Design a protein around this ligand. Structure first.
Ligand SMILES: O=C(O)Cc1ccc(O)c(O)c1
Ligand SMILES: [Ca+2]
Lengths: 557, 206
C-alpha cells in the first residue's frame, strides 16, 4: 500500500494534496464501498473496505485521512509448560492453572458434522502443542481486548477538525496501521498507530518465550512512543509499507524486512525531482510507480562494474547494455500481451541464479526454499497483491554493498569468490536460459507481460461472486486496489476542497434473479485501467446537482 | 423529522445518507449496503466466523476450523456489552438497516434476491451487532494485524545452530533476519526523531 502527502511548501496551486493507494489485491465486486454520511455530527465522503462503519479513506471538508499497513511486531508466542498428568492445566507463576475451553460443532452441507475444542490460556489461544516436550504454544496479541474500540476509533476520527482532535482518536486505534492527515490550511501529518508490548529486558521479539511467568509483558507502551511527525522539514510524507523511523523494529515474519533496498525510494525520487508539484503531477506518480521495475536501480551498478572489462561481442555484456539503456518503466506492446523491453525477464532469471548461488547455498534444507524467490513469481492471472523486492534480494543487496552495509556478514555469501565472478556466472546462466527460448537477437525479444485479475473469491479463498464474474485487465499495475486524491485550497476553484477516487468494478454488486445486472456494476472498470478518476462530492448543493435518484424512509426505533 | 432517513444516490450510484441521529444515520448506511452488496457481505460474514462449510460443504471444513481456533467470540461479545448507548447505536442501527432490506428481500425474492443466492442455493439471514463487528475483526485485526512466524524462526535458528555451531548459527540468523537495519529508508527523517527502545537480539530468553 502506498501514500504520498504534499504540504504547503511543496505544493503548487494548493496548500495540501494527499494521494493514497491501499493494496489488498483486486476483487469483484470491489474491495471497498463508496458512501457519504451527513448528520449526527458527521459530514463525510469517501470509500472504505467491506463498508465498515468508519471510512478508512476520505474527508470531511476540513481534514483528510488515509492508511497503509504498519507491520510493527505486536504479536509474540508463549511456550506453555504442560503436564502429562493434570491435562488442561499449565504452569503459571508457581501454580497449575486451568485452561479456558469451548466446544465447537462445524455443520457441513452434504456431510457429517465435526466437533473439536479450542483452548486458551492467559496468554491467548493455543496454536499448537508439542506432546513430546509437553509444550503448548499460545499466540499473544497486544491488541487483544481492543478490537471493538479500534473500529470505533476509525469512526470517531471522521469528526475531527484538527491535529489535536485527530490524534486523540489515533491513540485508541490498536492495530498496527499507519495513519495520515492533511488539512485545509496546508498542515500534514503521520502517526504509526497501534498497541505494542512493554517487553522484559532480554526478550528477543523474533523467537518464542517461556509462558511460566517471568517473560510476561509488563504492559503496553504509551502513545508518546509511537512514531509520528507533523509538518516535516521536507514538505512531504511518503510510505510504501517501509519503516516509519530509524531503529524501529519490524514484524517478526521471516519473509519481511526493512533494509537498504526498499521500494519507497521510487516514490522519494519522483517527489524530490521537482521543487513543487501540482495535483495533476501528484496523481501522475501513480502511473510511474505502477510501471517501475523495482530491482533495476538496486543491481544495475553491480552488473555494470562486472562487465566493464568485457568485449562488445560477449553476450553477458550485451545483456547489461540493454539494461543500461532502459529507464525501467514497463510498457505493453500493441499486442496487449508482451513488454516492449526485456529488462524484467533478464533481472528475474539473473536474480534467481544469484540467490541459488548465494543465500540459498548458506541455508540448510528445507529453509533454503524461503530465500529463493526472485519477486517476479506469478501465474497467468497475475500477482495477487503488490510487487515488492523479495527477502533473498534484500539480503543479497546488503552482501553486494560490502562494508558499506551496516549488517555484519557472519557468513560470506560469495564463499571466497570475487563478487564479479559470481555475477558473471549468473549472467551466463541468464544468457543460456533466455537465448534458448528467444534466440540471439535481443532486440526482437518479446517477453510476457503480467496481467491483472479482479477475482470472484475473496482474500480468504471463499467465493463472493460466481466464477464468471471474474474480470481481467491486460496491464498489471503495481498500485492501490482503489486510488483517491484530496486537494485542499485549490487556487483554481472557489471550493475549499476537491477530492476524487475510483472504485472498480463499480459501486454495486447487484444482479437480479433474471440475470439483469445493476447499472453501476461495472461503470468504473475502464476508468481504473486508464488512470482516470471520478469526483467525490461533499456539499448538499454538489450532491443535489449530481443526483440521479432519491429514496426517503420513515422509521422509528 | 427525527424519523426521516433521506438517501441520495449520485451519477456513479454512490449513496449519501441524511439523517438526524446516530441510529438513523447508520440504519441508512446498512440499508444501502444490503442493497448494493448483500451476497458479498454474507460470504464475508461466513468467512470471518467460520461458517462456510454449512453452505459450501466438505472442502471448507479445515478453513472453518482454522477461523474458529484463531479467536474467542465471548471476548468480542463482552466488548460489545461494555459500549455506551451512543456507540452501541452505530452497530445496532447498521444491523437494523440491513435487516430492513433483508426483510423486503425475503418477502419478494422473485425480483429482489441477488442471483448468487439461487446459484449457491441458500438465503440471507438477519444480522446482529456481533456480525457487524466481526466483519472488521475478521479482516483488519485477525488477518492484517496478526502476523507472526516465531515458531518457524525458532526451527530456522535450530537448523543454523546445527550447521555452524552455537555462536555462529546465531550470528547467521542475525544476518538473515536482523532485528533492525540502520540504512532502511524511513517515512520520518532522522532530523525529526528516532525510535527510543533497544531490543535484545541474542534470544536471551533461553
Ligand atoms: O498493505 C497491506 O498489505 C494491507 C493493508 C492493511 C491496512 C491498510 O489500511 C491498508 O491500507 C492495507
Ligand atoms: Ca514477535
Amino acid at each position: 500500500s502506498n501514500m504520498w502527502v504534499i504540504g504547503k511548501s511543496k505544493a503548487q496551486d494548493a496548500k495540501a494534496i494527499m494521494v493514497n493507494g491501499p493494496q489488498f489485491g483486486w476483487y469483484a465486486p470491489a474491495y471497498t464501498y463508496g458512501i457519504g454520511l451527513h448528520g449526527a455530527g458527521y459530514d463525510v465522503t469517501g470509500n472504505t473496505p467491506f463498508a465498515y462503519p468508519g471510512l478508512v479513506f476520505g474527508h470531511n471538508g476540513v481534514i483528510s485521512w488515509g492508511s497503509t499497513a504498519g507491520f510493527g511486531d505486536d504479536v509474540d508466542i508463549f511456550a506453555e509448560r504442560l503436564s502429562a498428568e493434570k491435562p488442561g492445566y499449565y504452569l503459571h507463576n508457581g501454580k497449575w492453572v486451568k485452561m479456558l475451553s469451548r466446544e465447537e460443532t462445524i455443520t457441513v452441507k452434504n456431510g457429517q458434522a465435526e466437533t473439536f475444542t479450542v483452548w486458551r490460556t492467559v496468554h491467548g489461544n493455543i496454536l499448537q502443542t508439542d506432546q513430546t516436550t509437553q509444550t503448548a504454544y499460545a499466540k499473544s496479541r497486544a491488541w487483544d481486548g481492543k478490537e471493538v474500540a479500534s473500529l470505533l476509533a476509525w469512526t470517531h476520527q471522521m469528526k475531527a477538525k484538527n491535529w489535536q482532535q485527530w490524534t486523540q482518536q489515533a491513540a485508541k486505534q490498536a492495530l498496527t496501521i499507519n495513519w495520515y492527515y492533511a488539512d485545509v490550511n496546508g498542515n500534514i501529518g503521520y502517526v504509526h498507530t497501534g498497541a505494542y508490548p512493554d517487553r522484559q529486558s532480554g526478550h528477543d521479539p523474533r523467537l518464542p518465550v517461556p509462558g511460566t511467568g517471568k517473560w510476561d509483558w509488563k504492559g503496553l507502551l504509551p502513545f508518546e512512543m509511537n512514531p509520528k511527525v507533523y509538518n516535516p522539514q521536507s514538505g512531504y510524507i511518503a510510505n510504501w509499507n517501509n519503516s516509519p523511523q530509524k531503529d524501529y523494529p519490524a514484524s517478526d515474519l521471516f519473509a519481511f524486512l526493512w533494509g537498504g533496498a526498499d521500494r519507497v525510494t521510487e516514490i522519494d525520487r519522483l517527489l524530490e525531482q521537482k521543487p513543487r508539484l501540482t495535483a495533476d503531477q501528484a496523481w501522475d506518480v501513480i502511473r510511474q510507480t505502477s510501471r517501475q521495475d523495482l530491482n533495476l536501480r538496486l543491481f544495475l551498478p553491480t552488473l555494470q562494474a562486472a562487465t566493464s572489462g568485457l568485449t562488445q561481442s560477449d553476450p553477458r555484456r550485451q545483456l547489461v547494455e540493454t539494461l543500461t539503456r532502459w529507464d525501467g518503466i514497463n510498457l505493453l506492446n500493441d499486442d496487449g500481451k508482451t513488454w516492449q523491453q526485456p529488462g524484467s525477464a533478464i533481472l528475474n532469471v539473473w536474480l534467481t541464479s544469484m540467490l541459488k548461488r548465494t543465500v540459498v547455498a548458506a541455508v540448510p534444507m528445507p529453509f533454503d526454499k524461503w530465500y529463493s524467490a526472485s519477486g517476479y513469481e506469478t501465474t497467468q492471472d497475475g500477482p495477487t497483491g503488490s510487487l515488492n523486492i523479495s527477502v533473498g534480494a534484500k539480503i543479497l543487496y546488503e552482501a553486494v554493498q560490502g562494508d558499506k552495509s551496516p549488517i555484519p556478514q557472519a557468513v560470506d555469501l560469495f564463499a571466497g569468490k570475487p563478487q564479479q565472478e559470481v555475477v558473471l556466472a549468473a549472467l551466463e546462466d541468464t544468457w543460456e536460459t533466455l537465448s534458448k527460448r528467444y534466440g540471439n537477437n535481443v532486440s526482437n525479444w518479446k517477453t510476457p507481460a503480467m496481467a491483472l485479475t479482479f477475482r470472484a473469491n475473496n482474500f480468504f479463498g471463499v467465493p463472493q461472486a460466481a466464477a464468471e464474474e471474474t474480470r481481467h485487465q491486460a496491464e498489471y499495475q503495481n498500485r492501490g486496489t482503489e486510488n483517491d486524491m484530496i486537494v485542499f485550497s485549490p487556487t483554481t476553484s472557489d471550493r475549499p476542497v476537491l477530492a476524487w477516487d475510483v472504485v472498480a468494478p463499480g459501486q454495486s454488486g447487484f444482479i437480479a434473479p433474471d440475470g439483469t445486472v445493476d447499472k453501476h456494476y461495472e461503470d468504473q472498470l475502464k476508468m481504473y485501467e486508464n488512470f482516470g478518476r471520478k469526483s467525490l462530492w461533499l456539499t448538499k448543493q454538489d450532491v443535489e446537482a449530481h443526483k440521479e435518484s432519491q429514496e426517503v424512509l420513515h422509521v422509528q426505533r | 423529522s427525527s424519523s426521516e432517513i433521506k438517501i441520495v444516490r449520485d451519477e456513479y450510484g454512490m449513496p449519501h445518507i441524511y439523517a438526524n441521529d446516530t441510529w438513523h444515520l447508520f440504519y441508512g448506511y446498512g440499508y444501502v449496503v444490503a442493497q448494493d452488496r448483500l451476497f458479498q457481505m454474507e460470504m464475508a460474514r461466513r468467512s470471518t466466523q467460520g461458517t462456510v462449510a454449512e453452505v459450501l460443504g466438505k472442502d471448507f471444513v479445515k478453513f472453518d476450523k482454522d477461523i474458529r481456533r484463531n479467536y474467542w467470540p465471548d471476548a468480542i461479545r463482552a466488548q460489545i456489552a461494555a459500549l455506551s448507548p451512543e456507540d452501541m447505536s452505530i452497530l445496532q442501527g447498521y444491523a437494523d438497516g440491513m435487516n430492513a432490506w433483508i426483510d423486503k428481500v425475503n418477502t419478494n425474492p422473485e425480483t429482489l434476491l441477488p442471483k448468487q443466492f439461487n446459484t449457491f442455493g441458500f438465503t440471507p439471514k438477519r444480522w446482529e451487532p456481533f456480525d457487524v463487528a466481526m466483519i472488521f475483526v475478521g479482516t483488519m485485526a485477525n488477518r492484517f494485524s496478526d502476523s507472526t512466524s516465531e515458531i518457524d524462526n525458532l526451527a530456522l535458528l535450530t537448523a543454523l545452530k546445527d550447521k555452524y555451531g552455537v555462536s555462529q548459527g546465531m550470528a547467521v540468523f542475525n544476518q538473515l533476519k536482523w532485528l533492525v537495519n540502520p540504512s532502511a529508508p524511513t517515512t520520518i527523517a532522522v532530523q525529526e526523531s528516532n525510535y527510543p527502545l533497544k531490543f535484545n537480539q541474542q534470544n536471551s530468553q533461553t
